[PDB]
Amino acid sequence: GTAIKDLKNPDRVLIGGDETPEGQRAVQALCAVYEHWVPREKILTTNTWSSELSKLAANAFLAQRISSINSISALCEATGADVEEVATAIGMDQRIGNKFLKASVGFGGSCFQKDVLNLVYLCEALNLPEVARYWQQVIDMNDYQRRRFASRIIDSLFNTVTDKK
Amino acid sequence: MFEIKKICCIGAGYVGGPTCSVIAHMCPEIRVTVVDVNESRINAWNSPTLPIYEPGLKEVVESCRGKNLFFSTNIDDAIKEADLVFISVNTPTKTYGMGKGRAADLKYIEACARRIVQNSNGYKIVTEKSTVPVRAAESIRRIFDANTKPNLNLQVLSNPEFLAEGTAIKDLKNPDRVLIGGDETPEGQRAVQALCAVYEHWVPREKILTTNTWSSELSKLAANAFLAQRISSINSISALCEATGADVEEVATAIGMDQRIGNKFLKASVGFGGSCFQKDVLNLVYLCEALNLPEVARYWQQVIDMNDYQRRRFASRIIDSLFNTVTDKKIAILGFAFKKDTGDTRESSSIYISKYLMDEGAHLHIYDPKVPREQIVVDLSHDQVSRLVTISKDPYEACDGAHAVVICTEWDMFKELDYERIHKKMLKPAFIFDGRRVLDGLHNELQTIGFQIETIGKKV
Amino acid sequence: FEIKKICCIGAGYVGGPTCSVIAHMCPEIRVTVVDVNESRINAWNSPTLPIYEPGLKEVVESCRGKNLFFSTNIDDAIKEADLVFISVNTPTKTYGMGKGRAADLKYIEACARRIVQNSNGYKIVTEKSTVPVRAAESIRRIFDANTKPNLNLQVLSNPEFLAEGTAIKDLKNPDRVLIGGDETPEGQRAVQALCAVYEHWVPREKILTTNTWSSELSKLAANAFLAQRISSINSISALCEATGADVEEVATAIGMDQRIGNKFLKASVGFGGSCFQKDVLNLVYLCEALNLPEVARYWQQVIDMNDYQRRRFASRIIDSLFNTVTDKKIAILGFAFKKDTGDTRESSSIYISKYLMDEGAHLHIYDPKVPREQIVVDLSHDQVSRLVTISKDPYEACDGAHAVVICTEWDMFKELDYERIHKKMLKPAFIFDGRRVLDGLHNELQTIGFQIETIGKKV
């Protein structure tokens, strides 16, 4: 949706490479390409696996923010609190920020669920079940949010929706 | 519109004390009176030596004490005179009964509510400053309504603190935001604007947020939970880093440069500590269970489990490295505080790491530059301490004949040690377990010296 | 306030017989029974009624034409009525949230919207069918949301308690009449108005007034308490077979305790019917939805025990036949859920047969009253074609069979020629008595050569 702007003025460019002489040369070659229009302060160099992992974790952190405020939204409906008020109050903490704190029926897109599910599987394959089920909560909460929303509609219509417009 | 001239605060803790001291300092026309049931605390605040240490606090207090800032044991009179009453008492986690070890105990808050109505007449604004469970203000409203009088109009507000213990004064003088919650009624709005007016003396109106009472209560709990979740998230990543060859400090950096995520609270560790994070998250979880929200409850519970996992994991790596036997082995523990530059050990990860090693029968030599000796012994009790715990006056006494050095607090001084010396008198193989990434950049040095060095979020 | 004109929506086995009786005891009241199905109505106006109940034909003929009417003109019948009975059946949901347990309120909702559209002034709206709790709140909400000037609709609960088979007798002399209404001035008036109607032939001592939610809940719990009694004695029956005790003896001893009573204590292969399981399951779901999991699993036990009883019985047959039943002829005697009816709804015979069909048995089924095609329908989802034969007489079913299974307490089964049956049965010949109908005949049957096993008796 904002591809061109994101490319022309990125928060950061991520490049991962082998921690070897040949590897460092290849990194600096690619680094040099981006230096044409990206300030060197905003170019980050890591080993290959940190770069791969950073892409997955970043999307997961984002998705977690949405699922977290969504969980709060459910607790708001039960207490009388208001999630937009709470989100605002949370978001004014500079350490937390005010982006990705808008509660919804649930997040979508071709990246968030796909990458978090991929992250979870990786942890299972690496015998990290505690970490796997930690991140799985992001998906379950999103599923919960949707199911919950649907169930409220159905209850409000007296648990019968047959042939109703 | 109603103006506040006299302020009473119940509780001289790390919350009410600095908050009211600052208010008095920025509002010379208002008489702020801080009271507490503990005569010890009161006499300490009026003493040349204060009961808690915060940068710039000593100056601020001395500027106001006597003019418009007073510390007294006379609670009833301070209530009698006050236009605004801050309830700033701690709500300890219940240690028994329904909700043991998770639910907040409202006993102290309930007492204050009954004490206020007993000693007050006319119009007064009653504001909860302490971290409370949601719908707590309903409990206060219920006590006031049940004990009403002719010409008694008590208004209940929520105004939670957000100061980090260590930078209190700066956080108060220049806060990211001030939160005030009130009833969505005419009388309620007046009370809100009265409190709002007090903060407008030195806080820009852009940074004052008004919500209903429950959003304010909930915001304090959720904010700390969001913070704690960040730490547990990067910690989970750290474990995945050790298994892949990735590096958590690199990953944290890459994540943190996303403006929508930010770079604060992304430093992996042996696990977070303090008197607020676990306490409030556990309180949040219990609330959800009580409200039949099991999906939400177990969602936030993951923040705590991951923190426990991180600690247990770290302890287990040490034990495995020492061939799953630690009996009668000397082990240096460097740093006992829950974070650097404090003597606070409340929920310190050092406690658990030490305790895990004690369950293996290790000879622990613990060093912390600031933490008092007696505090360590208390935090490691329920006999067990006498056999296994030795407390070193200096770091080197702890590494003399030790199998391993475990760093559990990110003290700046640990980075600057003579590790050439330490290695010479250590048993081989000699291990360093860095639980705070403080020796990042020193790895190649330590290895060529002869150390085996392991740290959070880096493959061995 | 007096009630003068009554409209009933639904000419089922509930609304039909109930309103015909009311007309017979209330000559001054004009009772109009309506249904959107033109088929049903003409049957009510026919010399042949759409349902059979003893003495119903008489009661109807007394009133039909004078103050009892069956019509398809629903809108006008609602317009004229002081009291509107909602008497449509509430089927269990077959999909979605609450599948196979929760009640579907669609027919009730339609009726509620139809009433408010076609009505003005003061009217009492009473639910007669077995409904889930808080259903009247749904009706109230439709009324409140679709209000008119000078519209005062009162919502009452008045559930049925008639056993299908002796409806009229149950109506003329009921154990109690139940009426639930709002605890408000207007609400109490509507209740006493309806209360007054039944006082025409029901003593005031046997008319109970409660709030609306107590009334709805009472109908479900009453059937559940009954079902629990059967499942309890059935559970005991299994414990009898394991101890040497006898369930008929124990049931008798228990039932002589005045505080317990001796009704509904007859052990069986399992209870059936269109009400017991449906209502208990509906009760369980209600508890789950209201975050009452302890109560939900408490009542679920009534269903599990009944399922256990059936499965247990089927397994005994299979074990006795050396755990192989493939291509073996087996006589099934009795298919109805109880004796003296053609009703097969939730009949234990269905499950027993199905368990035996999953073993590849050759079932020859006989039932004196139950129609042939109904059995074929109740045993489908191909499997029926290969394994199920329907016998015209019992002996056709026991000719070359390995075992005789009795699943319905028909009186005639007691009087069969077991000497003849045994000669043309394969050996060893088994009789499995699932209804204790052959109690007292055991020593007889054994000397003939039968191995006889029954519910609640050690072999």
Ligand SMILES: [Cl-]
């Ligand atoms: Cl006092």
Ligand SMILES: [Cl-]
């Ligand atoms: Cl030990």
Ligand SMILES: [Cl-]
């Ligand atoms: Cl019509």
